[PDB]
Each structure stands twice: as C-alpha cells, then as structure tokens.
Amino acid sequence: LSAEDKAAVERSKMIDRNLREDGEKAAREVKLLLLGAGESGKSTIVKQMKITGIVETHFTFKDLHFKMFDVGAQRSERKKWIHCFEGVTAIIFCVALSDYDLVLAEDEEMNRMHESMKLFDSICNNKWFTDTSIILFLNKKDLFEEKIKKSPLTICYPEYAGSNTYEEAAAYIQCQFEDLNKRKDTKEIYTHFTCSTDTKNVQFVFDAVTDVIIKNNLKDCGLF
Amino acid sequence: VEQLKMEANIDRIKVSKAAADLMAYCEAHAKEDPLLTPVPASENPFRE
Amino acid sequence: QLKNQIRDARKACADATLSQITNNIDPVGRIQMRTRRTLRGHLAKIYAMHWGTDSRLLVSASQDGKLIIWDSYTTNKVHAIPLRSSWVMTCAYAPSGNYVACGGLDNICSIYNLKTREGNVRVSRELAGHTGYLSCCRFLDDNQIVTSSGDTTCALWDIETGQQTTTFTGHTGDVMSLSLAPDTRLFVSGACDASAKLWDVREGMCRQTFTGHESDINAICFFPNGNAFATGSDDATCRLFDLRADQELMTYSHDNIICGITSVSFSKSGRLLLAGYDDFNCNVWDALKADRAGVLAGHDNRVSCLGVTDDGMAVATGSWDSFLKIWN
Amino acid sequence: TLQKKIEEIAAKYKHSVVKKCCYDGACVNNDETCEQRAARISLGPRCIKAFTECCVVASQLRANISHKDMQLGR
Amino acid sequence: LNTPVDKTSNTLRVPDILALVIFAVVFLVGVLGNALVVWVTAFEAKRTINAIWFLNLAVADFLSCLALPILFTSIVQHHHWPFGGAACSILPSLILLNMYASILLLATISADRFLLVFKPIWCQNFRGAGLAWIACAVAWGLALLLTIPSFLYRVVREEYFPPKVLCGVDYSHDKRRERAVAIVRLVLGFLWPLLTLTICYTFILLRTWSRRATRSTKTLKVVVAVVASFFIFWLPYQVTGIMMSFLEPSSPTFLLLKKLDSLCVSFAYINCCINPIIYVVAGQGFQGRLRKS
Numbered sequence A: 001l002s003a004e005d006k007a008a009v010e011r012s013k014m015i016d017r018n019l020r021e022d023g024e025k026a027a028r029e030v031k032l033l034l035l036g037a038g039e040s041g042k043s044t045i046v047k048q049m050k051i052t053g054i055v056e057t058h059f060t061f062k063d064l065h066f067k068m069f070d071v072g073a074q075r076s077e078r079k080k081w082i083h084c085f086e087g088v089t090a091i092i093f094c095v096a097l098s099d100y101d102l103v104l105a106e107d108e109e110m111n112r113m114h115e116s117m118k119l120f121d122s123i124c125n126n127k128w129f130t131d132t133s134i135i136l137f138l139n140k141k142d143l144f145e146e147k148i149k150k151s152p153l154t155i156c157y158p159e160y161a162g163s164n165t166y167e168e169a170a171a172y173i174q175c176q177f178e179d180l181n182k183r184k185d186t187k188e189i190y191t192h193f194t195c196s197t198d199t200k201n202v203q204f205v206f207d208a209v210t211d212v213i214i215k216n217n218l219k220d221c222g223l224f
Numbered sequence B: 001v002e003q004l005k006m007e008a009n010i011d012r013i014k015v016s017k018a019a020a021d022l023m024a025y026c027e028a029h030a031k032e033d034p035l036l037t038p039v040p041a042s043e044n045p046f047r048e
Numbered sequence C: 001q002l003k004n005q006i007r008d009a010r011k012a013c014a015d016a017t018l019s020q021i022t023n024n025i026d027p028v029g030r031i032q033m034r035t036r037r038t039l040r041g042h043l044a045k046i047y048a049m050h051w052g053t054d055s056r057l058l059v060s061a062s063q064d065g066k067l068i069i070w071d072s073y074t075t076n077k078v079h080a081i082p083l084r085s086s087w088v089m090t091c092a093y094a095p096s097g098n099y100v101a102c103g104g105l106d107n108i109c110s111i112y113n114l115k116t117r118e119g120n121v122r123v124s125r126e127l128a129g130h131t132g133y134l135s136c137c138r139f140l141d142d143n144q145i146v147t148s149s150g151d152t153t154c155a156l157w158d159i160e161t162g163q164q165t166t167t168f169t170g171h172t173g174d175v176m177s178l179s180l181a182p183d184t185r186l187f188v189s190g191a192c193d194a195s196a197k198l199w200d201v202r203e204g205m206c207r208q209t210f211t212g213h214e215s216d217i218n219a220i221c222f223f224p225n226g227n228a229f230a231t232g233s234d235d236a237t238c239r240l241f242d243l244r245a246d247q248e249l250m251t252y253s254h255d256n257i258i259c260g261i262t263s264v265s266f267s268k269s270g271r272l273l274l275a276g277y278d279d280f281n282c283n284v285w286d287a288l289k290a291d292r293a294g295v296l297a298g299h300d301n302r303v304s305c306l307g308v309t310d311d312g313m314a315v316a317t318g319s320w321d322s323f324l325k326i327w328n
Numbered sequence D: 001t002l003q004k005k006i007e008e009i010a011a012k013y014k015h016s017v018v019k020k021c022c023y024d025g026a027c028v029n030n031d032e033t034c035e036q037r038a039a040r041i042s043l044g045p046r047c048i049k050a051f052t053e054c055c056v057v058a059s060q061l062r063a064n065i066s067h068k069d070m071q072l073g074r
Numbered sequence E: 001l002n003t004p005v006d007k008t009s010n011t012l013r014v015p016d017i018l019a020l021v022i023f024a025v026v027f028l029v030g031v032l033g034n035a036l037v038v039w040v041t042a043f044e045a046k047r048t049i050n051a052i053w054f055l056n057l058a059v060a061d062f063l064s065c066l067a068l069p070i071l072f073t074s075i076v077q078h079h080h081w082p083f084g085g086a087a088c089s090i091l092p093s094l095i096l097l098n099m100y101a102s103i104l105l106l107a108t109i110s111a112d113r114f115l116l117v118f119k120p121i122w123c124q125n126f127r128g129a130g131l132a133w134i135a136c137a138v139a140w141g142l143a144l145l146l147t148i149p150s151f152l153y154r155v156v157r158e159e160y161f162p163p164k165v166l167c168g169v170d171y172s173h174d175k176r177r178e179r180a181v182a183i184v185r186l187v188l189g190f191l192w193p194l195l196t197l198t199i200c201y202t203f204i205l206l207r208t209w210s211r212r213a214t215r216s217t218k219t220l221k222v223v224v225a226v227v228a229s230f231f232i233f234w235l236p237y238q239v240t241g242i243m244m245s246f247l248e249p250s251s252p253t254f255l256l257l258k259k260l261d262s263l264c265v266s267f268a269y270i271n272c273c274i275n276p277i278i279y280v281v282a283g284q285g286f287q288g289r290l291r292k293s
C-alpha cells in the first residue's frame, strides 16, 4: 500500500517539479516565425542575426533569448499546421523587392511579387495571428534599385503613377504591403529595408519584440 | 488507372447486411460495454 | 467512366439506409458522463494521446515538448520524456507497452523504449524519409510501425532496420489521420483530398476509396468489428463507412454546430460513437441512430484528442487547455 | 481616586435626587461645559449646587489622565 | 426619573448614522467581491504571477471586511468594549495590520507594473512567483512593524458612573512618542505609497503612450481610477488622525474631529470595496475565469 504508492507519488512530484522548471525555462525564450516566398532572402536574414522538416535557430541579442523557426522546407498545406504557431511572439516576413520583374516558374503568368503579397495577406488575415505582429523585411534593396533604372515598376503595378526612382517605388511597395492589413487597430506591422551587409536588422527585431512583450505584460496586468 | 480498376474489381455487399451485422455486434457486446450501461462504483476503478 | 461505374455499383448496394432498419432498436437513454480524474501535468496545447492495452496507462503529447505516461487510476506520472522536437502532433503506445512513438512537424519519427536497463527512456531509433510533417502513426507490432505524413504518402517501417518496408502512395492531398484494424492486417487513412482509402499492410495496394466527405478528413477510427470505420472532417460532419458495403452508411451532423471535428473514437461495443468537436466540447453519438446521446463540456479550449480504453471502462479526452479528463 | 472621590461627595447629601443629580453631573460630556449644562436643571438650588461641585471635581480629575479614546480601526 | 437631569440624552449622531450605513454597504459588497477574487486568484495562483498580488490584496480586504461587524456593534454600543484586555491589544492591531498590508500591496503592485513596463527584458529573464511571494511577505512584515505600536500602547479604562468599558491608547503624557508614531505612520502609510503610485503610474503612462503599438486608453482609465480612489478615500482619515495626534483635546477642533472620526473610518474602508471592483472590471474576463475555476 504505502511502500509503493508513496514512492510513486514522490516520483510524480519530482516529475512535476521538473516539468514546471522546463516550462518556465521554455517561457523565458521568445518564439519567432520566419516566412518567405521560397528565396525572398531568408538565408541572408538568418546568417545576419547570429552570434527536411522545421528548422529552429537560437540566438541571443541584448540578453534576450530568441527562438526563430523556419517552416519553408515543409512545402505542405499550411492550413493544417499553421495553428501550431498561435503563440509566437512575432512573425518575420521576408520579401525580395526584385520580385517585381520575375514571373513564377511554375506559373509563368503571375509575378513573384503578387505571390508574396497573397501570402502576406493570407498570413496577416489569419484568425490565429489576429494579435500577432509582423516584421516585414524588404530584402535586395541594392539589386532592386539597380533594376529600377532599367525595368519600370509598371510591369507588375499597372496602377502605379510615379517616377522611376528608388524612393518612390519603395514607398509604394511598402504602402501596398501595409494596406493588405485589415486589423490596423490591434495588429501593427514593422517594415524595414535590408541588405546583405547591414546589421541593424537585429536591433529592429529586438525593438519589435520589446514592444510586443510590453504589450503582453500590460494585457496580463489588465492595463492594456 | 490501375488503382481504380482494382477498387472496382473487388466485390461488394448490400448495405442492409452490413447494417444488420453492425447491429448484431452492438447487441452482443451491449452488456460488456461499461459506457452503454452504468457500472456499480465497486466495479468502477475510478471511485473518486 | 470507371467512376460512374463505381457510383452505380455503390448505389445498387444501397438497398436501404440502415436508419430504417435500426428503427426497431430503441434509442439509448441520455447518459451524463462525469469527470473522474483531472490530469494537470502538461502546460501547452495537447495534440495527441493513446491508451495502453492494459487500460491503465496512457501517453499524451503536448506542444511544449513533453511525453507524459499517466496512471489513469492514481494520476501518478510514470515517465516524462523530453522531446527532441517540440512541434509534436502525434503519439502512439505500443501494444506490448515496450515502446512509444512520436513525431510532428519534424519529419523524423521517434521511437522511445520504456523498459530500459538504465531506467531512463531513450530513443530506440529515429525514422526519417518523409518530406512532409508526420500527421499520425500507430504501432503495428513491437518491431513494425505504420506512419502517415502530410506529403501525400504513408509508410510502413521496420524499427529494427529503420527502412520503409512498404510505401503507400495515391493520396492527392495532405494525409491527416490513420487507424489500424483489429485484425492488424488492414489500416485506413484519410487525407485533405476529402477521401479515405483502405490499404493492405503487406500487399501495399489500395483496396477501396471513399469520397463522401466535403472537406479535409481530420480524424479516423476503425469500428471494433474491423469492417467499418468513422471519419471526422472539417465540414463538421462525421460519416460511417463499411468496407464490405463500400458505401457511406450514416452521416452524423447537426445544424447548430458548424465547426469541424478533430477526433473520433468508438466504444468497445461500438454502439457509442464519440467525436471531439472544435466547439470547446465533445459530443457522444449513437452509431446506429446518429443522435446526441451526451455532451462533454468540461474542457475550456478546443478538444484535440480522444480515445476509449481497450475494455471501454473509461474515456480520455485532451484539449488545448493542457488538461486531460477521464470520463466514465 | 475618581470613583471614591465622587462617592465621598455623593454620600454627603442624603436626598436620593441630590445623589442622582450628582451622578449625572459626574457623567462625561465634552460637547457642553458645566455651567451650560447645569443651567437647564429643573429642580431646586440644592441639585444645582450638587451638580456644579460634582462636575467641577470631575473636570479636575479627568484633566490629569492621558488615555485618549481611539475608535476601533484607527 | 431615570433620564439624566441635564437632558443630555445620548443618541447616534448624523455622522455616526452615515458611518453605520457606509459600514453595512462596504461590508456586504467588499465581502462578496473579495471572496470571489480570493477564489479566482487562488485558482489562478498556480498558473500566473499576477494572481499572487491580487490574492494577497483580496485576503487583506476580506479580513478587513470581516472585522467590520465588530466596529458596527462598537459604534452602536457607544464605543463599549465588552472584550478583555488582550482582545483590545490584538484586534485593533490586526485590523490596522490588514489595512497597512492592503496599502503596501497596492504599492507593490504599482512597483511591479512599473518594472514590467520599464524593464521588460529583466522581467522576462528573471520574473517569477518567488519574487512576488517575497515582496508580499516583505509588505506584510512592514505592515506588522508599523502596527507594533498598536500592540504596545492599547489599553482599557473603566467608566464607573455610566457603566462602560473604554478601549484606547495611553502614552503616559509622552507627547514626543505620540507625535513620532503619528508622523512615521503617515509617512509610511499615505505619503510614500501615494508618491510611489503616482510616479510609477505616470512613468508607465508616458512610456506606454510614447509608442503606438503599446498605447491604449484603458491603462489611463485604470490608473486614474486607482489613484483618484486611493487619494480621495485615504486623505480624510490620515489628515484627521495626524491632526488629532498633534492638538490637545481641550480645543473644539478636537470635538469636531471626534464627531467626524467614524465617517472618516467608514470612508477609508471604501478602498477595500473599490479594489475588487477595479480588479474585476479591469480583467479580460471574470465570468470565464470563474467558470474555469
């Protein structure tokens, strides 16, 4: 009776202690979701913020433990596994500005920029990510600026009415990507232009995560 | 093509016979099912 | 052409809907299942659980990355395994109680040995080869395990050698659930193509295919007789299929409820068909009449897993609230 | 000292009503002074004098203590 | 015959009647709310860190409310003390300890919110239930340390001619000790906590409105409500007490303050009723939390 049941209860109590410790340790880390249109520059972002199934990358910045998850290798219906990331802190979205002059190889009719915009709209308007913020990275700034001097932007934006300059084209792209967001009151989008040499992306992600965690703490305290 | 003709070649049975077999199975194991009929607390291992 | 032929054959098979013949059977009185044990070990959203052949121990997997083998009677925790991949959505309990399977977004399927000499649960072998996420897996034997993955394919593995002895292909969408038949010679699998297929364990050929559902199949369970199985779909309807009849028998649906189904299970006698819905509750259906026998509203979040003991002594239902409740 | 000193003066007078008025003038009352109070006495001068002296000796006694009445909760 | 000859028949004053009504209302509402909050937080005490502070607050306010009926009977009985000399030293000290604990718990809640708003990384890295429990224990210990004078000087005196037992405080003509006790009590119970609340919540609101993502109007409403309620409901009691402990009884101001005393305590007790309401209305959902419990 006692000699076995009480030993089992002690084992269960030790298991409970270990489980609570592991849960706290996991809660210490910040979870991030990385998305992109195949080759929008995810590899660059990954190798920048650093000190076959899902790929998890751990990196620490300003004493804050990050846990970024890359799901591009799944190549399966996102609808059946997108709900797993309901609790991620923020979403890092990568888009290559050069996608305006490239057509999808599998389609040959739709531009890569349109596919990226569709994916961004699907992710933003997702019911699971209603409160999750998005960090939009517009990669390939230099290559996009170089190409704009030769290929007009109207190839993929027939409604575009502006000069063929980097500033106006980038502003138009950012406004288009931000307009897709419907819940502009609860959700906030942080847009930033990046290259292969700039390292300020980590500080941008850190600021976004700090804002998100401050909002979460205010909500938990009942202030927000 | 092969899988389709294979599924088509396999025989089939009337729905009424399968339903009667299901009903007979449920009736036979009625007493054995602890969820269908309530079980006394003494036999129930989940006392409290 | 062949599709219309199969349709005509199945229509000719439908001599009469069993709802007519089952009228003689009196409807079972409504039963109120009360919770007995509340398991509060997990901390994240639970995704899958499996009962043991002894009807005593049950394994549960949570997104936090922990496998917990619960003693259903005393509530004690038998083992706590730290998962290598926290994104788990499927787990199984071997029939002999010697091994436990696990997997999820990580295409690798992990087999854990419980009866080790060191006393610590260690990975027996890592099974790789799937390009998509592991959706469901079940132990065919102490050395053979069947698996289903989102990459439109299922596979049977040999835990000793670690290679696919047989690969099942033919699904036109993501494979979601899998169920082994009692005879252990057949298994059924449902996918996102709104269809379910019966596969041979050794021949590897698709015996039959069913297309009665309107949306993705979320759950699948074999009737204890082995000749029938139920299927849960996102369209908020559960359907009963029979292999001999090769046709849909009954459709369990209701107007007020519109959200899809996540889990389905049968009692030992098969009279009671339990289905875990996405409405933060679970429903009990009469397999012979398709009526709301009971409703389980103990869980606060979406119900994720459901399973009845081998003897039907009790029912286990997990949810995203990190709590597993036993009912009987 | 207070009770005994007051009973000493109370025993001096014999008429029960005089002891009554002395009992009463010995009662604590801070809202009104003695003269103000002794003024509205309805009986003869005996009761007035008894009330006055008893209220004088009481004031000369209560003024020495330092126990401050504090309501429950402060 | 039996009535007093001086016609000074004793009767409950208007401020006393107001104090009694406020006592009844606060007793009922605070009892209910604090019981509900204690239940919910004790159920949530294992899953969240926020539940600890509000659990302690609700326990303190529940004890303060349960102590009210004794105050009601005392007021109705013209401050008659039927209990012995030990209850007079224990019970008032206990209620004062509960009040000071509630105040210092509100202060610690403000400090924790300020730390969460200004130091998010440090909290994410090292925040836990242990630190919250340690802070609550420190608050209770500070309250007991501030209450020690209640245990020290509470004594009973006898009223002979009007049969009555009077509880109170005797300093043995030591004005210095009374003044020091009143000053330290005011400083550590109303001045320091009020300043902490004000500064912390002002900085919180500033840092929250500095950026759009975290900016919100609910935080401003909650901050204003809490601060205004605390100040309004605690100002009269503290002022009246500190001015009582400083002036001699012979002045008529002392008589007016004694008349107003009951109303002051009844008003100060309104914070115990306000706190549960503020907690419930501010939470994401109470009915859901209750059903979960």
Ligand SMILES: CCCCCCCCCCCCCCCC(=O)O
Residues within 6 Å of the ligand: E191, E192, E195, E196, E199, E203
């Ligand atoms: C006798 C005085 C008692 C009151 C003492 C209150 C002390 C409050 C201190 C608040 C510090 C706030 C610091 C904010 C950070 C910053 O400096 O920018």
Ligand SMILES: CCCCCCCCCCCCCCCC(=O)O
Residues within 6 Å of the ligand: E217, E218, E221, E222, E225, E270, E274, E277, E278, E281
């Ligand atoms: C006798 C004193 C009565 C005072 C009662 C004070 C009640 C304050 C209630 C605060 C309501 C806060 C509403 C917040 C609404 C929101 O979520 O934005």
